[PDB]
Symmetry: D2
Subunit: 255 residues, 4 copies
């Protein structure tokens, strides 16, 4: 399939997990891809594996200078931006009592201000190339919370509400804005947890049980939702949350 043929797609967080699998799937679908990641070597590795239709660039999406620079390099190379996937983000454990105020602020700056900054510099370019599609990464936890990840969970509800507002702000400009809400996805964050566990498969079983489907999702499964929303298969979808979560947010199947 060539759903994004010759479309220019920026994927932030593109060095690993969801962003990687999205950058690769978009390129398989004919896109030019900018692989943007806080870790420059990871971004370059993934762009190198994709080949001449990708480049990797180091971006801390919390940094306005990085974000505007990422856009300048993209337009210098391919002259336009058709799709932006805001997938940079992270989480920590703790509650309001135990989360350090610096950690709270870092989470909000990367997960939510990141969208605001990349979109701030991308959207003037889409306005000069007939519009485009922006896709944010929220979480099933935006609506069905979990305990002891409080800053992360707050950041995800910001992303869901911001997605609706942005869709309203930019509809008249031909710019669609939607978000994907993944369930618990096997990712480098989990790879490390498992690599450091005495009992990996048991821990995994615990994560599996968050979903009614009784497993974790994969990066490639989320990339498919990103592709649906980036492509013309979803041209009448804007301000929506597309959930792919194994049924983690639809009711308590453990009672």
């Amino acid at each position: 399939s060539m759903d994004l043929n010759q479309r220019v797609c920026i994927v932030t967080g593109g060095g690993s997990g969801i962003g990687r699998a999205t950058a690769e799937l978009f390129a398989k679908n004919g896109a030019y891809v900018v692989v943007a990641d806080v870790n420059e070597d990871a971004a370059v590795r993934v762009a190198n594996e994709i080949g001449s239709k990708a480049f990797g660039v180091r971006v801390d999406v919390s940094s306005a200078k990085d974000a505007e620079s990422m856009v300048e390099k993209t337009t210098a190379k391919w002259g336009r931006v058709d799709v932006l996937v805001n997938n940079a983000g992270f989480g920590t454990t703790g509650n309001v009592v135990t989360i350090p105020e610096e950690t709270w602020d870092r989470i909000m700056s990367v997960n939510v201000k990141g969208i605001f900054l990349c979109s701030k510099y991308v959207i003037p370019v889409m306005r000069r190339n007939g519009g485009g599609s922006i896709i944010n990464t929220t979480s099933y936890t935006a609506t069905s919370a979990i305990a002891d990840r409080t800053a992360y969970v707050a950041s995800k509800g910001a992303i869901s509400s911001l997605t609706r507002a942005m869709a309203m702000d930019h509809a008249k400009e031909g710019i669609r804005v939607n978000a994907v809400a993944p369930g618990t996805i096997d990712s480098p964050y989990f790879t490390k947890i498992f690599a450091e566990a005495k009992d990996p498969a048991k821990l995994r079983s615990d994560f599996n049980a968050r979903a009614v489907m009784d497993r974790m999702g994969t990066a490639e499964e989320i990339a498919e939702a990103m592709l649906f929303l980036a492509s013309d298969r979803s041209r009448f979808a804007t301000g929506s949350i597309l959930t792919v979560d194994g049924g983690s947010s639809i009711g308590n199947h453990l009672v």
Copy 2:
């Protein structure tokens, strides 16, 4: 030509017109065998004939237990299995709780919600035996973001939305995913009829994108949820409504 449903057996109710027709056709373009099931036998047959030997049409009133079980039996005699069920049979009416007649209220509940119940009652035993599958219901943006003066219809869509979650939890252990599509206002011969006879601008104005959707656009979301590209999605509502339900842009 993608073949996202290559050799999958798909039943599409309300398959004679509008969304269900566009879904039946798209699934068949994607290599499915299609059962076009419609309240109007002629309409169902007309679409199956159009698609060719990979489809057949069957008259079904989804409010009838006897029609629904017989639909499943013809399907299995022909192709031996059911991989996908699209519940698209449905209708609405104008009025509020004061003006809607009690008979119309009941009929809207029988077709729009009980139809899912009866088709799935007979489909799921078959899916259970063939390793599971995918069931896709049709809710509406209005389930979440109401409109005035279609009150029975609106209530029925909320039922479909909640029923989709309950069913997803009921049947996940059997490898059956249940999800729903929430369309916005979709252009159709019904809307043509009124346009032929401010109104259109007002329909367009429901969506922040300021137009209506098409049957084909909702068929793409049906195809995504029927296919293996949404293998990790269950109990979800996938909204394709031009932003009609996300806030008041007016």
Copy 3:
């Protein structure tokens, strides 16, 4: 004693037991004239007798248009107006789409959803003449956060939540607010019966607060919505569920 409904005329369906009874009693303590409507005649009259002269009990099957209309006619004959309608008649059953009999599916939809439509069909023309009022439906936390093996019940509750929003939009212009309460699992004699201590514990565990709610706790939400304390609220769902629908605390 708060007098949040003083002299207001209030119809409560399902008033003979559980949430509907606690609501009828709380409304009367807050000064209301109360119509205790119930599918069981004895249960409605019992409650109305215990309340005293500011209540009457009437047999009503909210699935019957005749009974619903008769109920409203009796109310306006006695007291000339209707200020509040609480739709609390309702029941559930266990099973899924495969095991639930068609007859049971239809009966759940007719009582739980059609009962709202029919009572309000006859109530609303009266409120339109008395300056509006407040209609309160009973949905469930499961309309949002489903449970397995109650599928007809769960479908009916999502119809009620959507219907509440549509109705608020249909009748705002008449000064009629329409809201619903979403209760959690509420202790009742059904639970006394089916109970041994492990199984209470599994029901308690539905809620992050690790208990079931009471009928009285739900009546306080019904009084909030029936009263003037909520005059700017319409089309809303007020959840009182101990945190049973806010995310999975058991993982």
Copy 4:
């Protein structure tokens, strides 16, 4: 007397919703800490209430001011039973036009203020048998509007944060809920108006009830959620918005 002798902290208590809440809590028997970024405003409200309130200057984005607020409260009255997080503000613009600093300032006051006040209040409640925390989200967390983009983003964070907190602290007997107000008449609006009549009419039209709400109306919802009348409610959003987020009635 729903809050008789309960100690209640109200941030943003110097104006709008926070002030009406502070006054209603005191009418129901509470000791009230009126906290506000503007000292004079807090003092003004505390003076009007009398000797059951004191005014304190607090910028809720400041960890120092927030812990200091709690230490003054426990030094005066020995306990905290209720925290109302109502400090907040919004701005017009979208992601292109909102300056970065404003975006940060909105997140810091609107969302981080909840985090910091609760960080210091919760350890107290934990020792005094639990309590009730009420945040102020908005109808727009659900039903967005255009051109207020950081403010809308902040309110979705507050709603999700409310659910998270209710789960984090249920075991301590601490309930956490939020109110979602509609558009609330205020001196800001009196100014923005003085075509005046038309402008008022557009803000009124956001609600199906075709008016703006009052601060005193939202205060009644704060008082329900503070008091024992809502003891089985936690993690919830209580909407009082004249039906502004329920569907498009325009």
